[model samples]
Target: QICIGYHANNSTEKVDTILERNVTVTHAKDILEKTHNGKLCRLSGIPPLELGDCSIAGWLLGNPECDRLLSVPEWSYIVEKENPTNGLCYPGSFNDYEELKHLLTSVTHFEKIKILPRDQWTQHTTTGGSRACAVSGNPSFFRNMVWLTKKGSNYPVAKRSYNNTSGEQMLIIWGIHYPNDDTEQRTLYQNVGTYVSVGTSTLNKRSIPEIATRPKVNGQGGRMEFSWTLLETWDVINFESTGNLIAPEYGFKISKRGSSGIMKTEKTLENCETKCQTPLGAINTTLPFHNIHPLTIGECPKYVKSDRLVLATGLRNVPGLFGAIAGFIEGGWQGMVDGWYGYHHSNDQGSGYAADKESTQKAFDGITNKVNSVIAKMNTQFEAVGKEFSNLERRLENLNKKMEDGFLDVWTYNAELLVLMENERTLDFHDSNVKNLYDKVRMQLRDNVKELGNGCFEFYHKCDDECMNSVKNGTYDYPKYEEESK
Candidate 1:
């Protein structure tokens, strides 16, 4: 039996748990998670695994040794596989074992690694957008990374776009155990259930706000650590079927403690020890790679463009992608399939066909030329249409409009004059004999004619002295009455 010690909060107190065997890190963590009282963490160090780092789960890649070790009956997809944990099973596999061992494989691999020569974050711009990245130049634990959301899928977790920061930071670390031999550890450690360490931290935009020395976190920024504390250690398990580890959700979640104050922090974690002082094992080594994707759009280290990278990860889990993967697997290429056919795994059996580089390039060139020609024709028509519209609008704004004039009658003018003369005759009657004659009338008539002609105009030259003086002086004023209206 092994006894594991776990702690929570900032208290030095820890909970010690004992177990009947050193078989599963999953079962060990289950004890702490269920019984412990705080966002707590514990270690794995004792007889079951006695090595360095103490990480759980590693890549099985493509190795026969990885196959034999993870094939343990305890790791079977269905309990009925009846295969031992270290046995072999892959229904339609050529070797039956390689596929099962590298069961958690992904079609994609990291195309790049983003890192800052210094330490910290640099950016995130897209909305509903998230980022994933890695860290280097630090210690073993500081060699951290970010995950993308599937919904945080990929191997990394998806950190959300929160204002300027990623709003979320969940760095995970998992390892498998092997014997003293590094190869054995890479293959069997995950199959047997090694412990895991997932971390949480606060960020100042793109940078980790703090770094501490020990497991305890001082996120306000300090030294030596990139960080996790009471970050409970848990083991992960994904089973392989007759073909491979197919079920994404059907894995064991045996647990004990948790990290951060996510649960409830207190000093009670030091209460139980069923066997060894800590966990009875250790992590042997790193085989393939430790970095993941949707890199946190940054500058210090080179990485993926925020929006573009997110778009790529999304298209990866597209519905028909699996069928595509199956087709690849059917041809005997490396693909991940769990519930594939027992004996009917071939997607296309008609042998396959291949084309050459020169032929493919020629076809693409032809297509490009047609596209360019079509665009040129469309542009010519568009320019002609634009000119016609501009002329139409100008005409509408400047329309010329005019009004008709009414003509006055000469006979009607004379009738109005006769009335004026009759009135003038009556006024002269009261003025006596001198005022009644044509002489005075002629004077008034001269004034009227004079008003219509220029003083020396040739049109009025036939007139006598009386008329000439009147014409030259122009017309008399109508009435001099001028007491400004009070």
Candidate 2:
């Protein structure tokens, strides 16, 4: 009486419990290979769930079709959204809301206005001996220096990249990042001088605009965390490889869990799936991890969120990729089942691969860097353009004086004003185009750099769940280059 036992949907977490009723291995394999959807096999014994204590974002759904619909990922295809134009999902019932749809048509990516993450990512503790968290935004750079503090902590709180409309000055703080290694705990951020978000000018002593808060991390310092999340999209994927109307997207988010700043490399996962904001983000704009399916033996499972999962892993969606925001609902049932092409990228953090893949990865890296470099150059060049505009302003003013003195005719003077305005408009368009282009590069860079950096900080590998063991084993290494040995 030998029947084949298999994991649900032939999943990785399927621990092969060959109940020892004295069954022969050959007979079991024979029955399983025939009846088990070709998978009546002992899978990875377990496909590690990354819900991290979140909702069942498509996992554990009972019915095979339903379970797979929620748990498996089809990396070869994209789950393009019903209407990704606004980065939000639109139910198909409202088929006549053309005006609203038209209004929502975006011309420029609005998220790029924030100049922090585009520069470089930094770190902040995720938890300690208290209600642990960091500022709910993609980490930014202070060029290595930072000064932050508390705002009035207003309603709608200050959003990422948006103006601090709260007007409630985000004032200074008194804090330090004392290592768990028991070093001197000194007060820093602003060792002495205070940073003000806004100050009064009646006395011409206006306030500052920086926000670095001093946190009291205990013997176990808080973990480093990112707030980015997936953008939701089409629930059912287009079965055909090219028409997966539901592509992936990303956004900022605050998760309920986080890994320690001390990163590890051996892939023991910790805080892998913290309950993220349902829509997911500090902004809660990203999607939660969904429909997590398994790969093969000795290989980490690569759920098919995108044909290029690793590349798209932590990328904040372009806000509206025309096919996104289904939340954890994309890939309805069996959304991950597809003709996946980019499977190798599923486990991108690993490097053992063919030369072609390396070239492909580096090619992507090269393109990202190329865009970033152009963006970097745009700044100074735009500065020069602004200076030219300032000069134009002076000439316009001088010409106005002539109009008042009758040095020129009314028609000529009016023409001059029109010309200056035209020039101003041209400059405006130039600056704007520059900004959008920079935004384009910045967004792509987030995806590229995250891949290169492994996590937020370069040289800081994702510890998975191996924090303690990694640090103890000294798995962390220094930056790739020595700074002039200085």
Candidate 3:
């Protein structure tokens, strides 16, 4: 564990306040390096120790009562002449925060890393109006992201949108993890769960504020809540163990972690509003943090699978008697039965009468026509079923195409808006670089023109009753305004 130091606000003494916690080395570094609302910090070299009240300002810094402490035996010197026993010092040694971080990171590879399951987080739904579009599908988690909310809390949560208006309520979001080789920086996020209920509001005119305030309603109709075990970070399992890992809920792996290129700064999240034209458009800028949409609609495949199974069962029950007669005639079973009697007639058995040719031919044709009619009836039903299947497919394909078109339009608007805004930025930058450079030149040219008439034109600045009187009188010799000859 690395120790972090904070400046004391109330203390009169010129000493640093230090504290230590057992967290991942990366987390410790983030806590120390990043700007949080809590405190300004610096780094220290103090390791964890049970010093009652030592004046060492490294990891565990100054304690309340430093009157009694053991000093390092190496070059013992009185750090404070006023009180010789008030400090702990090691001779000829210095602390470097960078070196400390390097040491921690280098040693971290050999450390038994604990793979912890992700906890559920909450987010509010996105809303929009006619000239606007809300979020299409739920977004997945990216690295170093947080859902900026109204209350002084920022949590990186998940959410899914519905057909109705986006409500001012919170949603429970979580990920299903897929474990891979231990060398990967992050495990694969295969599936995500976004649970939300549709509200009564219309979607066309509503808008999500920059800092959204969630409604205060508790559990209501169609309520859902999930509980998870408060598991601690423990390395009880080996590298070969799979018991602790989260299995993918969607049966297959999706992709890597969400978009990683969200610019790492607090100001970028806030400055986005002014630059964006629409209110929902501003939020779209930040929504890239929750990036990928693996499934078309998150809950579509399960319903489609159910529909397929139903169709399959219906097809399996479609054929019986017609199919039986068709197979009997097609397999020559009727001919075989007739052939047995024909053999007795043709073999000259005294007990049997010879078969009549016309009667036998008529019987064969009658059976053939009966089987043909059965086949025609079967064909009609098959054609109807085939047409129904075709219609189903066509409708589904058309529905997919329409949804695709709608999403394409939404994305097109987003792209166009972004392009326009970026163009504005580009123009602003160009003016700043080029126009600002030539601004001085323009000023000098105006100054030169003013001097051309012996400062008569510049008299406009000094204009008052006296300047007006001079202009009205014949005494003023200001340059006369005239159009140039064509």
Candidate 4:
């Protein structure tokens, strides 16, 4: 549907050299732009081919024929004219050399280029680039063309090849209409099948880099490949009409195409259908509270107050049971009050047998006195233990310090002897003078410090481990006791 055009000038009247030089440069530019959507510039009404600034210099200078066509003097004039001052305008000044090469190759005669089918073209671009040859019209009808100088041949026809070779088929499901209402329309649009594939790009509408067959699923008609006619019918029956079908090897592919909007809305509705449930779905009844647990005294039917004699006899006969019954009644009362007040009540209820306020206060006072007395006793005992611990701690600290000093002294002496032996070995028989021996002793002492330090560290670690173990097992209790005594 769309056509692009190009033009070139070849004037013979000009100097033979100038004519050949200009034509070569012009042809190169023309070919580059025709095949590629390369950068272009329009001057007033005339369309001048704009060769990429980068390739322009190499293209002009690299062509062997350019020198004879445009004498050195004329070529220099052309270069100075085009690039008067700015180095950026000079040929080979463009930084995108690789990009220019790719663009050149894509448009040039050696490479085949084709305008794919509309649907295929859009899909290709959306998926990124296309190689499929346009099949609708004459294969020779050039959508775009480019010219390039071949090393041996003067003219070359750029051939186009299919981007994909699988002969992969596509089915367009059309014609099912959707309601105009917005919500319904949205559903219809959403459910419409935009693209389908049974190949590597099976689920994805976009093409995959590596071609592969669709994976098989176990069931009737489990394969992915299908004929075009079958695909169309599949779409119509599954989506357009309320019908289902059984087919050979490949399982059914339901196609539904309605008005774009309604298709979208129906999709949402169908998904929501999964969550719907019957009005009276399922019923559950709770067991009576009394039946769950034995009826407490509070829940038992009240006896007539006038039957005091019988009531008194009954309570006296079962005193323990009556006490329990009274507790149950009080608990019920407190539970109800707590529930109404939205507050929590302590479980004890403090001896429910207490009859009045005075008795209840007396019971509470007794408990408070007992608790305070116990705390006071505990504090006194802790104070005594603390004092004893302090005395023991002081004694243990002094003992530890003394042991560390003694261990350090022993290690230092042992290290000095070991270093002296090493230095003696390093001395020669001729250097065995007293002065030399004294110097050797000094050097030995310097080296011996390292050994002394290591010994000290080893002893420190052992002592620390022992002390830590004692502390963990409470054996270190003696240290605090001794310190406290002092």
What is the TM-score of candidate 4? 0.11
Candidate 4 residue-wise lDDT at 166? 21
Summarize candidate 4's per-residue lDDT along 1-486 as a digit string, tens digits. 000011112312211121121111111100000111112211112121122221222332222212222211100001112222222111112223323222222110111112123232211111111111122321210112111112222212212212232222222111112122334323322322222222122322211111123332221111111122223221221211110100111111222221010000001011111110111111111101111111111111111111111000001010112222212212212222111111111122221111122322443454345333422332111000001112337886577657655744553443334223322221211112212322322342232212221011011121233443332233432323222211
Inter-residue clash pairs, candidate 3: 46-59, 129-204
lDDT, candidate 1, residue 425?
A: 31
Best by TM-score: 3
Candidate 1 per-residue lDDT over residues 1-486, each given as its tens digit? 000011111212121112111111111101001111221112221111111111112112111222222221111011111122211111111222222222211111111112111122122111111111111322111121221111112122112221212122211221111133333323322222222222233321111111122231222111211111111123221211111011111121122122110111112223222211111111121111101221111111111111110000000111112222212212211122221111111112221111122322433354344333322332111000001112335653233111001101332233234323432332222122211221232354442323221111122223333333332233423232222221
Error of 3 at 262 (Å): 28
| True-structure lDDT of candidate 3 | 0.21
Alpha-carbon error at 195 in model 2, in Å?
A: 12
Which window of ten consecutive residues has the lowest lDDT sum in model 1? 307-316
Q: Residue by residue across 1-486, what tens digits does model 2's lDDT show? A: 000011111221111121211211111110000011221111122222222221121111111112223322211111212222221011111212232222222111112112123222122211111122112333222111122222122111111222222222211111122222212112112122222221122111222222233343421232221111122221111111100011111111111111111111123222222211111110111221111221111112111222211111111111112221122112111221221101111222442111122222433464355334422332110000000112337886566555434622442343334333333332233223323322332343332223231111122233323332222233423342233311
Model 2: residues >4 Å from true position, as ranges? 1-34, 38-115, 118-160, 163-188, 191-486
Candidate models: Cα lDDT each: 0.19, 0.21, 0.21, 0.20
How high a TM-score does candidate 1 get? 0.12
Give the lDDT of residue 62 in candidate 4.
Answer: 23
- Rank candidates, TM-score, best first: 3, 2, 1, 4
| Alpha-carbon RMSD, each predicted model | 45.5, 37.1, 46.7, 46.1
